[PDB]
Amino acid sequence: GALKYLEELSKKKQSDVVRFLLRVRCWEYRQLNVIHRASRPSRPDKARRLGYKAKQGYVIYRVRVRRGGRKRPVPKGATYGKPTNQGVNQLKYQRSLRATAEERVGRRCSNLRVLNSYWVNQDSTYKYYEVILVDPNHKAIRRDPRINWICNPVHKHRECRGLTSTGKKSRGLNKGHRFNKTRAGRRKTWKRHNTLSLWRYR
Amino acid sequence: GKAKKKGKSGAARNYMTRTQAVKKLQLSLPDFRKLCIWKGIYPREPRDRRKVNKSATASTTFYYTKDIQYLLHEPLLQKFREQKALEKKISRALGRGDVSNAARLERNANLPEKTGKPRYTLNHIIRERYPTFQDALRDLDDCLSMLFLFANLPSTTAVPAKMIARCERLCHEFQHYLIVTHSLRKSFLSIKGIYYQANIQGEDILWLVPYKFNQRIVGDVDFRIMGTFVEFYMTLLGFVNYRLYTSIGLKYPPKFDQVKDDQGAELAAFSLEGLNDPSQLFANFTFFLSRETPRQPLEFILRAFGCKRIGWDAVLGEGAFTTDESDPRITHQIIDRPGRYPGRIYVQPQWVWDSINDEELKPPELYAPGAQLPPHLSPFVK
Amino acid sequence: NGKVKAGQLWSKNKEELTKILGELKTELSQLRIQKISSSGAKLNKIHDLRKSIARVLTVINAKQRAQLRLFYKNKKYLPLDLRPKLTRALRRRLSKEDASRVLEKTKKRLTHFPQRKYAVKA
Amino acid sequence: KWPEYIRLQRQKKILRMRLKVPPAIAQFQYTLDKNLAAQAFKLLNKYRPETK
Amino acid sequence: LSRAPKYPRKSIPHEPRLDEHKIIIHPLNTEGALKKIEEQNTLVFIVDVKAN
RNA sequence: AGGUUGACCUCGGAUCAGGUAGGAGGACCCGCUGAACUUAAGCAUAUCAAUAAGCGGAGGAAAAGAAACCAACAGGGAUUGCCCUAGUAACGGCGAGUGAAGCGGCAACAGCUCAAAUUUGAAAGCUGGCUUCGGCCCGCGUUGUAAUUUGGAGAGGAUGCUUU
RNA sequence: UCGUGCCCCGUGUGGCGAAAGGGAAGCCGGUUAAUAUUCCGGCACCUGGAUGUGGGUUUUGCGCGGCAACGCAACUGAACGC
């Protein structure tokens, strides 16, 4: 199997061969559109371990997103309330650039379902991602029990609700004491802890 | 109401040029010309060609817009596209080295060089062009002239040799129908060829057949569009022959002997089987054809006018009633050479034509060998 | 007169149904003018003609749609109006066979270890 | 003025020539010649996989 | 290529929306129409608003 | 014929064959974004509040979920919810205030699928088209579609019984 | 016709936006309880299309006259330009 070798080669991102490939691919993806279709995944081992198959109904979309922080759309970058002791140049978006990439790719292809996505390259201005999408309407997808769970309507726009891997990472859906506030849902847990319960025989 | 603009109505809408027609149908020029010939799209002439196209010259060809609209719905366009895609697949298989796949895909091409039939089927086009069998019988003049001309031509890329053999087969089947029904009426020998006139279901059918020599194909003709005409006419003649044989209650197609055809039977290789008075003018005679005499027209005329016993020289082919010239049963002998067996009538070939044209037996002393023949008159001009 | 019942209409085929529809429309056309010119016991007749036109159109449509369904009984693709309506979500829902498809390892495990029928002694 | 895809592929080839290529990728530019490639294919054409 | 569908999107060709019985509703019985009948050889009709 | 004839790769066109998306509803649900009045004597930490407004996305429920868990015991054993833990551990100008979790009882219980292996004595897999419904084609796919394995193991052996 | 192609050209890019801007063409007389450059009568015009007749031109093939300004019922004119 070659994919084991591709895995250990992708681990070594500071090597000369990987740096050369990353540089030339950064230039090529910068000359391409912000969202475009990849004919085949440029990281086949990563795509295969994230769930991509060489089957009709699996597509790959490459996308670049502008990296850095978040800026609040206020006039002249100023707020007219109480002082904040900070500027809009240090506001941090609570989701990931990978999640932004997934939503923009899903809006470009609203007929598909986002399965997952992966980092492929980056520079100072952009981060580059490759998003795996599955066609829920294709017969080969619908006849395959390993994937036709995504044809059900409960998985419409998983990237818009945080049901992808980066969505779970940003929502903090992990077990244990470090994730007390968020493991069952932060707002649901807050509602449960702030609900006043009155029984009949109290 | 709103004022009309110039050039948006009238002859501009009524006509289009050949270039505009080709671009509208999205065809190549050979396919467009082939489709126009097969569907009967004829050139037209506007009163003022500048009102149709400002760049038109005297050599510009015009067609009807409604005719091109009718051509837009012809199912042969998809046949053309399918054949183009199939040829691309064959080229791909040959380039990859899949010779078995290339042969299997070439079997779907239905090439004329392999089948003897036209590459595309024109069965619906025949019914579209001829609403009635009377119209088919009226166009049989051109059909028979074209097919009897092309039955004696060398093989080319436009008309392959198997296609030429199919043309000869159809002509022989039509001749056998005429012989069995005694429909042949008049014949003439001009300086150009042999004219035949028959009467099929009340329609007078006149056609010209070349003498059996080497026919010259000159560069002044368009041989490929002539081959398209030949394809259309063989598609017509097959259906015409089937209808005639079914009407007279015979099995179509007739039984054909490949071995006899190889030995040279020609007309004699056909066995007509049942399904499931000028006609008897040569009924009691036995004819012998010497080799210098035209065997195919002589046999056709004698068998159509009632001769049941025709032998000839051995090199003329298989199927003679007798082969030896010393047979005492022979009554008449056709010779054309400048030692005569007794009790036999030796005549030149003009005696047969004159006798069938005047419907009575001529005196043989005028058609005796070496004598000056009487003038051969035209049976069509009164 | 002017009342055409569906029991007689369900036995006809298309041409005399078209003839009846034309005659009813013609009678309605002249009697609209008769309505604007005079009145009486007459307006019941034009109401009956309107309902008869509706009945004839309904019968013609039903018979011709039945013929189209018979024609499209054994074809893969049907016209959209002849396809079942249901709801949009019901049409987008997975089919029964595709929802009931299982993997081969699951099939083997269910073949050899299904849910058994058992009881426990008290 | 070529289309963007033609310009992109030509500039990609040009950039791969202009930059310094590490040996692990640069070794793939050394290939068999015509004669040895033809002999290898002549041997391997007798062992093609089974068709349908 | 032009469209060659495998099924018609509409099984029923629609009946003509505006036939003659829908175009002509009733004539006008007013005195203007009655005067125009003899003064002009002109008949006046109330017709559908979509008819030209 | 080689200045030709092709095989691929990438990128396009078509009222091409077949499909899908949008909007509504939004009480409940999943996220993003995000106040101030109020309470702190006033007031830039704080509180109101990780709330209101705004934006995106589902369903009859959603979400979560079969441990990179809790624990420190003689150990429990996916998720959710109720009672209790507990106004407790803990955080907090000049203090107003804020505030969980393990265990325990109960309601309900259900477990699994891939990537990383060579089928290599035979891509065994699949979309679509035409069908006489037997199949036959155009293709996808070896830059990997089936079977097998998923840590509870498994693979290879040995071995003798059971199962459909 | 190696029949399944070749040649020419560059200028870009769609829509909305004026009952007072630009713009093809209708006047008079009469007529109703109420409309009229809209109806009725008479007399016209514009735009577009098809195809005739007369007349014109042509055997010096695509008119003639006036020194000229130009005139006369006609009196060939594609691309590309002014």
PDB file of C-alpha atoms in Angstrom, chain B residues 92-225:
ATOM      1  CA  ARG B  92      -9.594   4.778 -30.175  1.00  0.00           C
ATOM      2  CA  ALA B  93      -9.615   0.967 -30.035  1.00  0.00           C
ATOM      3  CA  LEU B  94      -7.102   0.715 -32.888  1.00  0.00           C
ATOM      4  CA  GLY B  95      -4.874   3.323 -31.242  1.00  0.00           C
ATOM      5  CA  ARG B  96      -4.947   1.442 -27.943  1.00  0.00           C
ATOM      6  CA  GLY B  97      -4.301  -1.860 -29.723  1.00  0.00           C
ATOM      7  CA  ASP B  98      -7.624  -3.569 -28.942  1.00  0.00           C
ATOM      8  CA  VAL B  99      -8.022  -5.298 -32.297  1.00  0.00           C
ATOM      9  CA  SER B 100     -10.896  -7.501 -31.086  1.00  0.00           C
ATOM     10  CA  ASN B 101     -12.777  -4.469 -29.749  1.00  0.00           C
ATOM     11  CA  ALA B 102     -12.082  -2.620 -33.007  1.00  0.00           C
ATOM     12  CA  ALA B 103     -13.498  -5.512 -35.051  1.00  0.00           C
ATOM     13  CA  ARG B 104     -16.551  -5.769 -32.775  1.00  0.00           C
ATOM     14  CA  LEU B 105     -17.218  -2.031 -33.098  1.00  0.00           C
ATOM     15  CA  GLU B 106     -16.629  -2.149 -36.868  1.00  0.00           C
ATOM     16  CA  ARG B 107     -19.329  -4.826 -37.072  1.00  0.00           C
ATOM     17  CA  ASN B 108     -21.778  -2.142 -35.886  1.00  0.00           C
ATOM     18  CA  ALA B 109     -20.722   0.261 -38.659  1.00  0.00           C
ATOM     19  CA  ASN B 110     -22.611  -1.656 -41.404  1.00  0.00           C
ATOM     20  CA  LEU B 111     -20.087  -0.722 -44.060  1.00  0.00           C
ATOM     21  CA  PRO B 112     -21.125  -0.995 -47.734  1.00  0.00           C
ATOM     22  CA  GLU B 113     -17.825  -2.749 -48.532  1.00  0.00           C
ATOM     23  CA  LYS B 114     -18.935  -5.593 -46.227  1.00  0.00           C
ATOM     24  CA  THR B 115     -22.728  -5.633 -46.625  1.00  0.00           C
ATOM     25  CA  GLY B 116     -23.387  -4.569 -50.225  1.00  0.00           C
ATOM     26  CA  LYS B 117     -26.141  -2.259 -48.925  1.00  0.00           C
ATOM     27  CA  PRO B 118     -26.083   1.518 -48.330  1.00  0.00           C
ATOM     28  CA  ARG B 119     -24.537   2.658 -45.054  1.00  0.00           C
ATOM     29  CA  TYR B 120     -27.808   4.277 -43.939  1.00  0.00           C
ATOM     30  CA  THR B 121     -31.301   2.834 -44.293  1.00  0.00           C
ATOM     31  CA  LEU B 122     -33.705   4.844 -46.466  1.00  0.00           C
ATOM     32  CA  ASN B 123     -36.904   2.827 -45.964  1.00  0.00           C
ATOM     33  CA  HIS B 124     -38.863   5.704 -44.414  1.00  0.00           C
ATOM     34  CA  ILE B 125     -37.451   8.100 -47.028  1.00  0.00           C
ATOM     35  CA  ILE B 126     -38.807   5.865 -49.819  1.00  0.00           C
ATOM     36  CA  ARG B 127     -42.334   6.046 -48.380  1.00  0.00           C
ATOM     37  CA  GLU B 128     -41.999   9.802 -47.814  1.00  0.00           C
ATOM     38  CA  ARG B 129     -40.861  10.493 -51.385  1.00  0.00           C
ATOM     39  CA  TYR B 130     -43.299   8.120 -53.132  1.00  0.00           C
ATOM     40  CA  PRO B 131     -46.808   8.242 -51.621  1.00  0.00           C
ATOM     41  CA  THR B 132     -48.040   5.734 -54.215  1.00  0.00           C
ATOM     42  CA  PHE B 133     -46.709   2.734 -56.090  1.00  0.00           C
ATOM     43  CA  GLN B 134     -47.835   4.553 -59.245  1.00  0.00           C
ATOM     44  CA  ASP B 135     -45.340   7.315 -58.409  1.00  0.00           C
ATOM     45  CA  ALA B 136     -42.706   4.628 -57.828  1.00  0.00           C
ATOM     46  CA  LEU B 137     -43.510   3.097 -61.237  1.00  0.00           C
ATOM     47  CA  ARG B 138     -43.245   6.541 -62.837  1.00  0.00           C
ATOM     48  CA  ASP B 139     -39.790   7.129 -61.311  1.00  0.00           C
ATOM     49  CA  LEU B 140     -38.653   3.623 -62.324  1.00  0.00           C
ATOM     50  CA  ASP B 141     -37.374   5.108 -65.620  1.00  0.00           C
ATOM     51  CA  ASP B 142     -34.611   7.051 -63.866  1.00  0.00           C
ATOM     52  CA  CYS B 143     -34.135   4.273 -61.296  1.00  0.00           C
ATOM     53  CA  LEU B 144     -33.663   1.546 -63.920  1.00  0.00           C
ATOM     54  CA  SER B 145     -31.404   3.663 -66.133  1.00  0.00           C
ATOM     55  CA  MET B 146     -29.147   4.529 -63.182  1.00  0.00           C
ATOM     56  CA  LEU B 147     -28.989   0.969 -61.848  1.00  0.00           C
ATOM     57  CA  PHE B 148     -28.447  -0.734 -65.222  1.00  0.00           C
ATOM     58  CA  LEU B 149     -25.688   1.806 -65.871  1.00  0.00           C
ATOM     59  CA  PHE B 150     -24.001   1.210 -62.504  1.00  0.00           C
ATOM     60  CA  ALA B 151     -24.268  -2.591 -62.731  1.00  0.00           C
ATOM     61  CA  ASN B 152     -21.334  -2.574 -65.206  1.00  0.00           C
ATOM     62  CA  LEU B 153     -18.954  -0.115 -63.508  1.00  0.00           C
ATOM     63  CA  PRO B 154     -15.621  -0.795 -61.778  1.00  0.00           C
ATOM     64  CA  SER B 155     -15.424  -0.752 -57.999  1.00  0.00           C
ATOM     65  CA  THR B 156     -14.799   2.601 -56.304  1.00  0.00           C
ATOM     66  CA  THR B 157     -14.837   3.978 -52.770  1.00  0.00           C
ATOM     67  CA  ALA B 158     -18.233   5.627 -53.297  1.00  0.00           C
ATOM     68  CA  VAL B 159     -19.803   2.521 -54.868  1.00  0.00           C
ATOM     69  CA  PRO B 160     -18.062  -0.668 -53.688  1.00  0.00           C
ATOM     70  CA  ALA B 161     -18.018  -3.941 -55.582  1.00  0.00           C
ATOM     71  CA  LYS B 162     -20.516  -5.707 -53.311  1.00  0.00           C
ATOM     72  CA  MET B 163     -22.848  -2.746 -53.856  1.00  0.00           C
ATOM     73  CA  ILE B 164     -22.373  -3.128 -57.628  1.00  0.00           C
ATOM     74  CA  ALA B 165     -23.194  -6.837 -57.300  1.00  0.00           C
ATOM     75  CA  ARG B 166     -26.352  -5.916 -55.373  1.00  0.00           C
ATOM     76  CA  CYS B 167     -27.305  -3.519 -58.191  1.00  0.00           C
ATOM     77  CA  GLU B 168     -26.850  -6.333 -60.720  1.00  0.00           C
ATOM     78  CA  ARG B 169     -28.899  -8.653 -58.479  1.00  0.00           C
ATOM     79  CA  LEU B 170     -31.797  -6.182 -58.335  1.00  0.00           C
ATOM     80  CA  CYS B 171     -31.659  -5.598 -62.101  1.00  0.00           C
ATOM     81  CA  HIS B 172     -31.721  -9.359 -62.721  1.00  0.00           C
ATOM     82  CA  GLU B 173     -34.700  -9.782 -60.369  1.00  0.00           C
ATOM     83  CA  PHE B 174     -36.588  -7.038 -62.225  1.00  0.00           C
ATOM     84  CA  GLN B 175     -35.729  -8.695 -65.552  1.00  0.00           C
ATOM     85  CA  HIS B 176     -36.994 -12.039 -64.229  1.00  0.00           C
ATOM     86  CA  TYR B 177     -40.275 -10.398 -63.196  1.00  0.00           C
ATOM     87  CA  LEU B 178     -40.641  -8.898 -66.679  1.00  0.00           C
ATOM     88  CA  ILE B 179     -39.898 -12.284 -68.263  1.00  0.00           C
ATOM     89  CA  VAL B 180     -42.375 -14.203 -66.106  1.00  0.00           C
ATOM     90  CA  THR B 181     -45.147 -11.612 -66.582  1.00  0.00           C
ATOM     91  CA  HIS B 182     -44.390 -10.894 -70.295  1.00  0.00           C
ATOM     92  CA  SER B 183     -44.537  -7.169 -69.532  1.00  0.00           C
ATOM     93  CA  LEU B 184     -41.823  -6.243 -72.052  1.00  0.00           C
ATOM     94  CA  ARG B 185     -43.307  -4.394 -75.028  1.00  0.00           C
ATOM     95  CA  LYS B 186     -40.701  -2.644 -77.201  1.00  0.00           C
ATOM     96  CA  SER B 187     -36.944  -2.578 -77.670  1.00  0.00           C
ATOM     97  CA  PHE B 188     -34.590  -0.380 -79.671  1.00  0.00           C
ATOM     98  CA  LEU B 189     -30.870  -0.367 -80.493  1.00  0.00           C
ATOM     99  CA  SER B 190     -29.572   3.193 -80.703  1.00  0.00           C
ATOM    100  CA  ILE B 191     -25.969   4.352 -81.064  1.00  0.00           C
ATOM    101  CA  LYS B 192     -25.953   5.058 -77.308  1.00  0.00           C
ATOM    102  CA  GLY B 193     -27.427   1.810 -76.009  1.00  0.00           C
ATOM    103  CA  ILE B 194     -30.442  -0.473 -75.833  1.00  0.00           C
ATOM    104  CA  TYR B 195     -33.803   1.102 -75.018  1.00  0.00           C
ATOM    105  CA  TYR B 196     -36.454  -1.055 -73.354  1.00  0.00           C
ATOM    106  CA  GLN B 197     -40.136  -0.220 -72.911  1.00  0.00           C
ATOM    107  CA  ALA B 198     -42.367  -2.323 -70.660  1.00  0.00           C
ATOM    108  CA  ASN B 199     -45.875  -1.895 -69.246  1.00  0.00           C
ATOM    109  CA  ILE B 200     -46.274  -2.554 -65.511  1.00  0.00           C
ATOM    110  CA  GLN B 201     -49.818  -1.966 -64.186  1.00  0.00           C
ATOM    111  CA  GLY B 202     -50.662   0.459 -66.983  1.00  0.00           C
ATOM    112  CA  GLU B 203     -47.467   2.536 -66.674  1.00  0.00           C
ATOM    113  CA  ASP B 204     -45.122   2.748 -69.659  1.00  0.00           C
ATOM    114  CA  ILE B 205     -41.556   2.288 -68.392  1.00  0.00           C
ATOM    115  CA  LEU B 206     -38.717   3.202 -70.770  1.00  0.00           C
ATOM    116  CA  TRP B 207     -35.064   2.887 -69.791  1.00  0.00           C
ATOM    117  CA  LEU B 208     -31.640   2.783 -71.427  1.00  0.00           C
ATOM    118  CA  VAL B 209     -28.971   0.111 -70.889  1.00  0.00           C
ATOM    119  CA  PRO B 210     -25.356   0.527 -72.083  1.00  0.00           C
ATOM    120  CA  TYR B 211     -23.693  -1.976 -74.366  1.00  0.00           C
ATOM    121  CA  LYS B 212     -21.451  -4.389 -72.472  1.00  0.00           C
ATOM    122  CA  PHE B 213     -18.083  -2.679 -72.919  1.00  0.00           C
ATOM    123  CA  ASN B 214     -15.687  -0.646 -70.787  1.00  0.00           C
ATOM    124  CA  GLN B 215     -17.564   2.402 -69.498  1.00  0.00           C
ATOM    125  CA  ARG B 216     -15.523   5.583 -69.104  1.00  0.00           C
ATOM    126  CA  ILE B 217     -15.801   7.574 -65.869  1.00  0.00           C
ATOM    127  CA  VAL B 218     -14.846  11.144 -66.723  1.00  0.00           C
ATOM    128  CA  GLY B 219     -14.044  14.052 -64.417  1.00  0.00           C
ATOM    129  CA  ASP B 220     -16.961  16.156 -65.673  1.00  0.00           C
ATOM    130  CA  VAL B 221     -19.421  14.256 -63.444  1.00  0.00           C
ATOM    131  CA  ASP B 222     -19.865  14.147 -59.669  1.00  0.00           C
ATOM    132  CA  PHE B 223     -19.427  10.422 -59.106  1.00  0.00           C
ATOM    133  CA  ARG B 224     -20.000  10.522 -55.339  1.00  0.00           C
ATOM    134  CA  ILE B 225     -23.382  12.249 -55.575  1.00  0.00           C
TER     135      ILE B 225
END
